[PDB]
From Swiss-Prot, chain A:
Cellular localization per UniProt: Virion; Host cytoplasm
UniProt-recorded name of the protein: Capsid protein VP1
From-to range in the entire protein, with total length: 600 to 850 of 2150
Oligomer status and interactors: Interacts with capsid protein VP0, and capsid protein VP3 to form heterotrimeric protomers. Five protomers subsequently associate to form pentamers which serve as building blocks for the capsid. Interacts with capsid protein VP2, capsid protein VP3 and capsid protein VP4 following cleavage of capsid protein VP0.
Annotated stretches, region: Disordered: 1-12
Curated annotation (Swiss-Prot), chains B, E:
Name of the protein this chain belongs to: Capsid protein VP3
Organism classification: Viruses, Riboviria, Orthornavirae, Pisuviricota, Pisoniviricetes
Provenance organism: Human rhinovirus 2 (HRV-2)
Location in or out of the cell: Virion; Host cytoplasm
Assembly mode: Interacts with capsid protein VP0 and capsid protein VP1 to form heterotrimeric protomers. Five protomers subsequently associate to form pentamers which serve as building blocks for the capsid. Interacts with capsid protein VP4 in the mature capsid. Interacts with protein 2C; this interaction may be important for virion morphogenesis.
Function recorded in the entry: Forms an icosahedral capsid of pseudo T=3 symmetry with capsid proteins VP2 and VP3. The capsid is 300 Angstroms in diameter, composed of 60 copies of each capsid protein and enclosing the viral positive strand RNA genome.
Swiss-Prot record, chain F:
Protein's UniProt name: Capsid protein VP1
Domain of life per record: Viruses
Record note on quaternary structure: Interacts with capsid protein VP0, and capsid protein VP3 to form heterotrimeric protomers. Five protomers subsequently associate to form pentamers which serve as building blocks for the capsid. Interacts with capsid protein VP2, capsid protein VP3 and capsid protein VP4 following cleavage of capsid protein VP0.
Subcellular location: Virion; Host cytoplasm
UniProt organism field: Human rhinovirus 2 (HRV-2)
Residue window of the full protein shown: 701 to 800 of 2150
Task of the protein: Forms an icosahedral capsid of pseudo T=3 symmetry with capsid proteins VP2 and VP3. The capsid is 300 Angstroms in diameter, composed of 60 copies of each capsid protein and enclosing the viral positive strand RNA genome. Capsid protein VP1 mainly forms the vertices of the capsid. Capsid protein VP1 interacts with host cell receptor to provide virion attachment to target host cells. This attachment induces virion internalization. Tyrosine kinases are probably involved in the entry process. After binding to its receptor, the capsid undergoes conformational changes.
């Protein structure tokens, strides 16, 4: 029952030591507690909101987003739990059309994974919508939710959840160095039409076939700056998840 | 084609589904898994880690190390209470421990908890102390003898640094809910079994640090997006 | 509770310590032909650098708040290790670390020591800011934590030790391989680690592939007129290797 | 049609009774290592509490309407059983019950006795109301059914016996393990039950894991001046067990 | 993909369908089935339970136990009728029995019914009584001898408490409909086979209680949302 | 005069999940909660939900309380938490009722 916690090792391990127990079939599975469970449930990642511009329909009606797990808190906190992690990815698209007009008609929408050094589309009419080898995929009104399996991408063994330095000329400290996945993209595929509409895609992912590397403590406070671990918010104070009580002798 | 017909539950997306899916990136191949140290398979190994309670959760200590610590008074001839806490894994302050957060990510819990305690005071100094647990349905104790009727340990503060002990699992149900609303799991409670005795002209003071972890007994169910943390608005970048 | 330690040419002991947990139980080793990326037969200085080196004296008080280092940068000046690092684009090494912290039988207080990974430090200031190289790479000079007036604050890391300088709770920090200097329990503390990265070896000066933290969890005191004690840390690199030899890095 | 009964230290008979049906045929037993939740070796008072105890005299008339109890609460004062219950957060027990109800050859009337499960009693009043603890837990004092003026009525249970106090028809009540005191058929009646719950053991004082009902299905009469007869009930707990010892419950 | 083509009956939901379905909650695991007493597999075991008829369904008894009971008059030298009932399982009052309700949850029934009867009067008292059944297509009997032409039992009220007897299944069809509209299954009918005799200065009265259950013969089909109970509006909470 | 395309969310909210307060609440994100979608012209959604209870079986009835003695009966034992629903399409001109 006595130990040296200062060893770093966990303390006196055994429950039968200080209770005169009856034998019990303690027989409760840890399988929900598995990584292929806890990481392996999907969640939303990012919010591709767009307005269909009329005045230059051909120019404006596309978006691009830098791929990261760092700007929706729940998913972020799953991964902000380790040094590194590796997984294959279910990716799932929840496209939504919102009408600013009496109807929407038929609408079709493009997505593209833009790995870095693909030519980024500049225009809803850009030749970059052609995609001989880029993973590009389509959705339209009344179609089911699109999904794809994306394998583990990194040039390294695992994604950096954190990093402790720079790209070699010393800026962008941390994940903004290592985590250059490039970007997702979206664009209306139907040609110019009269209906003023917003398209919103909620994009979801689940990590499966997962592996993870050296656990690290959970985030204590609101996020702030995607790649950066910054937490001291402007004109604000560090109101953590800990809550105070009047006296330590009162539960 | 084969005659087929379609059941309900088709055409939805469920964030907790389970299926095969087609590849966005066929013919690709991942980087090899080098033998990185620090393997993991489950959350329970994190549960096995002792983490400090911020036991001393008040204004005068919160913005500092000191909320992990308590101060003891060698001046006092008394049997009386040093501190007490709940035992419900997602209650304050315990929720803020890493087992707390992992439990806060979950809805059901089971199995006994390990607790541990170091006499952080001057090496020349002696005491023995009562660490005790209260089986609930009852108020938190108000005499040392009350806690002596509960399950408890008296700490022989020998050469060895730490006493470690367990709240036995005494839930009626095999699990309990991880966060109580209008509900309770019982209390930790701490008392001067002897007075604390420093030898003369030692600092008139001592420190205690307190640890918890899941025992081999411990487990969880109903992983849920945790109580413990909030996002307001957009996360900027 | 006694140990002796011997690496490359140099030796260490405490006769009041409890043994290191080896980080994740993995005793340090060289890269494998099965896992490697770099093509050459790499630089093994062996005994001439997998040997101890030690940092300038810090010292602490009841008023003190914390200290840390980032590795390998904290050892950039350790002769053979330092230059062999600076002359290669890449390398890898684990570490054996011991922290030296004796007091009398008549002192109280405690430090936690945590070995810690990429430990990606948060800025001091709010908003569109990040940490500047001079501070992420303090060298052997390290980062003690202080109350006041650190210039270039926009590029400084936060001083917020109990938020682990990254917005995570202290006391859960025992998730990493760690020990306590507790003046009753011990007079010194120790930890050893292999190499680690997402990559089989790494750009040493460009990325602190490991980091080390020491925190005054319980305030130092004694009634004696010796109101303060130094701390010092010694490190040996382990299985140290370097690849892509060229000029000395600036 | 004769029986004798012996539990823990105490014994019972009727020489005008037809044997109990054992509830669902399951003769009482301790928990199993295969099914248990609680970790300790639990409290077996055995003979000192798996023995009989009996309730205060009720008495009945042609005008009488019904009586019931909720268990273990109805036995909270039964020495060893009562305190061993109050000092533990959890326990479990089955019961042997016999109801004592002799008349002359010259009486008529009949009672149904029903052992009944959670028997979740309905309020007296309509609307947003529920039963108060004092009444769900009447102790050994029990709930006789009466025509008038029970205070705190908003928290009282209903008196509606032929609606089984829950809005279900009487006469279908024989769905439970049951017997009749019929003055021609018998002079007493008996039932025995194991433990039961959705859980392997339960918070005794917080939940009446069993309940017992007796109802004047046919009115008591005789021409004799002895216009009324008492009833009394005796119970032994069975395989009684308790776990999570702490202070006495209030 | 495989060439497939789609039959009608696709894309509907049927509240009485039968299929596999995908999980909302993959990797979950249920609590173990402890050996709770009071197992059940089918409704027929409930049918096997004797339950009381509220035989005496009138204003003067309905809001009380007494509608389960009948009163007998030892004063009468007569052969005459004590009571009668239908036999259609979902007719009043029989529907209100638990076999009644279970039948009311169903559209078809078959097999013979058990009926049972206790002489609840003073132990010193004697009688013998006629319990009889009427095969239908005919009026409910108006003399005891009419019932004596029906299938019937004469109750030797010995030391033993109860007479028990069966309406034989004599449906033309293997089943019958559970509720008759403009239809009939036959009658139960009850008569003084002797006069009831109490000995002197006994109460000038007696009681009888009546029971029914499914025999081993009994069965049902076409489970339907029962006649017996009504919900008006929203169920408040 | 029309409905257009409409999409609708459901979530099982086990107790101690953060309950959505708003049709824009971050709680519509659902990394592990069972959340599921329907839209105009889609077939009827379904799922298999396994047996949930912390105990062996659901209480159809209960004979007491949560330990400090209110909510007598199933209102104690039967805390399954809640189902939830929410329109997923963004703001649009069609006044509509959704009934599930």
């Amino acid at each position: 029952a006595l130990d040296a916690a200062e060893t770093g090792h966990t303390s006196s391990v055994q429950p039968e030591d200080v209770i005169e127990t009856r034998y019990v079939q303690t027989s409760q599975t840890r399988d929900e507690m598995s990584l292929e469970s806890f990481l392996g449930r999907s969640g939303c990642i990012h919010e591709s909101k767009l307005e269909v511009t009329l005045a230059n329909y051909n120019k404006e009606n596309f978006t691009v987003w830098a791929i990261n797990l760092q700007e929706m808190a729940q998913i972020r906190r799953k991964f902000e739990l380790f040094t590194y992690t590796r997984f294959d990815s279910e990716i799932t698209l929840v496209p939504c059309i919102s009408a600013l007009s009496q109807d929407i008609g038929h609408i079709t929408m493009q997505y593209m994974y833009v790995p870095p050094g693909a030519p980024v589309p500049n225009s809803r009419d850009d030749y970059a919508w052609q995609s001989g080898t880029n993973a590009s995929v389509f959705w339209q009104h009344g179609q089911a939710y699109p999904r794809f399996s994306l394998p583990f991408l990194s040039v390294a063994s695992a994604y950096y959840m954190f990093y402790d330095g720079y790209d070699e000329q010393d800026q962008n400290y941390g994940t903004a160095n290592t985590n250059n996945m490039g970007s997702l993209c979206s664009r209306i595929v139907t040609e110019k039409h009269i209906h003023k509409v917003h398209i919103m895609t909620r994009i979801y992912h689940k990590a499966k076939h997962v592996k993870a590397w050296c656990p690290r403590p959970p985030r204590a406070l609101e996020y702030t700056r995607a790649h950066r671990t910054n937490f001291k918010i402007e004109d604000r104070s560090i109101q953590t998840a800990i809550v105070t009580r009047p006296i330590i002798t009162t539960a | 084609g084969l005659p087929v017909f379609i059941t309900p539950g088709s055409g939805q997306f469920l964030t907790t589904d389970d299926f095969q899916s087609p590849c966005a990136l066929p013919w690709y191949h991942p980087t090899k898994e080098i033998s990185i140290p620090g393997e993991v398979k489950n959350l329970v190994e994190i549960c096995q880690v002792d983490s400090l309670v911020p036991i001393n959760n008040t204004d005068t200590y919160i913005n500092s190390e000191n909320m992990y610590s308590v101060v003891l008074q060698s001046s006092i001839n008394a049997p009386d209470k040093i501190f007490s806490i709940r035992t419900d894994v997602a209650s304050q302050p315990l929720a803020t421990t890493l087992i707390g957060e992992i439990s806060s990510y979950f809805t059901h819990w089971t199995g006994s908890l390990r607790f541990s305690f170091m006499f952080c005071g001057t090496a020349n100094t002696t005491v023995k102390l009562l660490l005790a647990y209260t089986p609930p349905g009852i108020a938190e104790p108000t005499t040392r003898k009350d806690a002596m009727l509960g399950t408890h340990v008296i700490w022989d503060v020998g050469l060895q640094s730490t006493i470690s002990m367990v709240v036995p699992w005494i839930s009626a149900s095999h699990y309990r809910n991880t966060s109580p609303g209008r509900s309770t799991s019982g209390y930790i409670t701490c008392w001067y079994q002897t007075r604390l005795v420093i030898p003369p002209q030692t600092p008139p003071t001592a420190r205690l640090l307190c640890f918890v972890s899941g025992c081999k007994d411990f487990c969880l169910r109903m992983a849920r997006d945790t109580n413990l943390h909030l996002q307001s608005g957009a996360i900027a970048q | 509770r006694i140990i002796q330690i011997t690496r490359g040419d140099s030796t260490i002991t405490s006769q009041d310590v409890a043994n290191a947990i080896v980080a994740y139980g993995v005793w340090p080793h060289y890269l494998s032909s099965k896992d490697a990326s770099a093509i050459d037969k790499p630089s093994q200085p062996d005994t001439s650098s997998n040997r101890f080196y030690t940092l300038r004296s810090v010292t602490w008080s009841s008023s003190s708040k914390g200290w840390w280092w980032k590795l390998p940068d904290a050892l950039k000046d350790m002769g053979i290790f330092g230059e062999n690092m600076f002359y290669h684009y890449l390398g890898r090494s684990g570490y054996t670390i011991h922290v030296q912290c004796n007091a009398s039988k008549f002192h109280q207080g405690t430090l936690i020591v945590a070995l810690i990974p990429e430990h990606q430090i948060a800025s001091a200031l709010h908003g569109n800011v990040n940490v500047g190289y001079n501070y992420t790479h303090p060298g052997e000079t390290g980062r003690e934590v202080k109350a006041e007036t650190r210039l270039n604050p926009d590029l400084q890391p936060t001083e917020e030790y109990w938020l682990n300088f990254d917005g995570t709770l202290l006391g859960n920090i025992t998730i990493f391989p760690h020990q306590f200097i507790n003046l009753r329990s011990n007079n010194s503390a120790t930890i050893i680690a292999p190499y680690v990265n997402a990559v089989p070896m790494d750009s040493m000066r460009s990325h602190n592939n490991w980091s080390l933290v020491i925190i005054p969890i319980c305030p130092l005191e004694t009634s004696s007129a010796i109101n303060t004690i130094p701390i010092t840390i010694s490190i040996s690199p382990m299985c140290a290797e370097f690849s892509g030899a060229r000029a000395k890095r600036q």
